[PDB]
């Protein structure tokens, strides 16, 4: 109960900050996790012993992918963590405790492959989930891991309460699904512009989520130029395998997936910031004034890209 986890100072001061990077110490990212749920949500959101059981049995529920791995549970939930710290009193208590159970689960048992090729492959998943596959899937794996012995969370929550949490979850977890993202953020310019948006409607609350769990889950557009331009690596090699097996199957991969086409990486940056990132960045800090950082660094971030173009990097 008096049990706090501690960081190094230097850490203690940058987990605050958006831009943070976990650091390549896999065995701090469990108590990076508790720490930061502990500040957002209180030491007694969740019994000790049980979230340490939940946090393993996340962890060893992701694969080693270049990309979609427990690195990047983590991550995101630093992210979501951030934006809820510079937004205290707009998010409820069981808001709090869901957005970043929401995000350490969003991806969990991801196999590196995107819903087309899924489709494509005719994976039984697509079978089982004709939309949001693999999120479906993620979501699916997160009620599992509740449900085993020892792991339930949310067991000091009243039945109303626990229902509502999973339904939080369950949204922000197929919000998540980018093919959705794009609906999701004109609905918000709209209702922002027109004035129509109101915090105390549910389905806009959701939209809200929907579009924090978006930015959350892109994030690494938001760190520093090294730590951006690094994990692009590991998302190409996802990528790079998924064309590989798309030529496998008798499918021209689209370019984004075909490594022969690795010369076209920095323009491909371009219409991805310009399409998707900044946009998402745009409507979040619009909504939620105190999340500008993300957008700040995500700009700077498409200005290095611009330099790559240019010959300069
Ligand atoms: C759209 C796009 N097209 C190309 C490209 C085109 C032609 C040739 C080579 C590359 N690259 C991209 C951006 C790659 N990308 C994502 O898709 C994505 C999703 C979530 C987080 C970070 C990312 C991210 O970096
Ligand atoms: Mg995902
Ligand atoms: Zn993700």
Known sequence: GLMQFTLPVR??????????????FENMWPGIFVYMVHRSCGTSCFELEKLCRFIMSVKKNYR???????????????????????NHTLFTDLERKGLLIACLCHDLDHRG????????????????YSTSTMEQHHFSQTVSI???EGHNIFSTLSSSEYEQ??????????????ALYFG????????????????????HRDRVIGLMMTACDLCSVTKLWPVTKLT??????????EGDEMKKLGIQPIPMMDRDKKDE????????????????????????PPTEPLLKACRDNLSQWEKVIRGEE
């Open 165 to 178: 949490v999973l339904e939080i979850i369950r949204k922000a977890i197929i919000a998540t699904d980018l």
């Open 232 to 241: 692009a690596n590991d998302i190409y090699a996802e990528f790079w395998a």
């Open 184 to 203: 999701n953020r004109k609905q918000l310019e709209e209702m922002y512009q027109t004035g129509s948006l109101n915090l105390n409607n549910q389905s």
């Open 113 to 128: 492959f995107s819903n087309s090729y899924l489709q494509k492959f005719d994976h039984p998943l697509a079978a089982l």
């Open 265 to 288: 990486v920095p323009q491909g940056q371009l219409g991805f910031y310009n399409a998707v990132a900044i946009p998402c960045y745009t409507t979040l800090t619009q909504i939620l």
């Open 64 to 86: 080693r992918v270049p990309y979609h791995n427990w690195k990047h549970a983590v991550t995101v939930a630093h992210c979501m963590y951030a934006i809820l710290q510079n």
């Open 11 to 24: 850490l203690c001061k940058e987990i605050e900050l958006f831009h943070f990077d976990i650091g390549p």
């Open 146 to 148: 509740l449900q085993l």
